[PDB]
Amino acid sequence: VVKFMDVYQRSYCHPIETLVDIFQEYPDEIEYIFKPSCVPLMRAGGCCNDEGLECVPTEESNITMQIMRIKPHQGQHIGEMSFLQHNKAECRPK
Amino acid sequence: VVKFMDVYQRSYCHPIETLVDIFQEYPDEIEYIFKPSCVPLMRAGGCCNDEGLECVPTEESNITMQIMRIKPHQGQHIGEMSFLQHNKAECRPK
C-alpha cells in the first residue's frame, strides 16, 4: 500500500510526460497521416488541494521531433515538427 | 531534436503514469472529499500507428493507497483505497 506522503507529493501539480495526439497540435493537418501519430510531451498535470486553484502551466517552450508525415497518394517525408511543452507547472486561482 | 526512432518508440502503446481524478474512479463517492483528489496510476496510453489496432490494457491489477478521505458528517481519516492499474498494454485489433 502506497504511503499517504507519497500519494500526496506525487499527485501534486507538476509537468508530467503526456502522450499527445499530433492532430491536437496540428488540427489543420488532418488530411495527413503522421507516424507516429502521437508525441510524448511534458504537460501540466496532477491536482491541487485548495479547490479554488487549478494546475496550469507557467513556463512554456517548444521541442522539436522528427516525424514522418504522409499525404495519401502524393508524398511522404520525415521532417521536424515543433510541439508545445510545459517546463513549469503550478496551482493558481480559477 | 528528438530522432524519429526515439519518438516513435517512446509513444507506442504502453502503460504510462497517469494522474487519475479519484472522483472519476469512484462515481458514487462524489459527496466524499479526498486528499489528494487524484492518484498517479499506470494506464495504457500512446498510439498504434495502424488503423486496425487500438491501445488497450492486457494484464490488470489493483493498487492500494492511503487517501485522507472525508465521508460527510464524519472525520478526516486516512484510508486505504483500491485503484485499477494496467500492468501490461498492447495494440490489439480494434
Curated annotation (Swiss-Prot), chains A, B:
What one GO molecular function would you report for this record? vascular endothelial growth factor receptor 2 binding
The parts of the chain that form a coiled coil are none
Q: Give all cystine bridges in this chain.
A: C13-C55, A44-A89, C48-C91
- What UniProt keywords are attached to this protein's entry? Angiogenesis, Cytoplasm, Developmental protein, Differentiation, Disulfide bond, Endoplasmic reticulum, Extracellular matrix, Glycoprotein, Golgi apparatus, Growth factor, Heparin-binding, Mitogen, Nucleus, Secreted
According to UniProt, the tissues expressing it are described as: Higher expression in pituitary tumors than the pituitary gland.
Q: Name one GO biological process term.
A: cell migration involved in sprouting angiogenesis
Question: Where is carbohydrate linked to this protein?
Answer: N62
Give the similarity note: Belongs to the PDGF/VEGF growth factor family.
Disease note:
Microvascular complications of diabetes 1: Pathological conditions that develop in numerous tissues and organs as a consequence of diabetes mellitus. They include diabetic retinopathy, diabetic nephropathy leading to end-stage renal disease, and diabetic neuropathy. Diabetic retinopathy remains the major cause of new-onset blindness among diabetic adults. It is characterized by vascular permeability and increased tissue ischemia and angiogenesis.
Q: Which residues of the full protein are shown?
A: 220 to 313 of 395
Name of the protein in its database record: Vascular endothelial growth factor A, long form
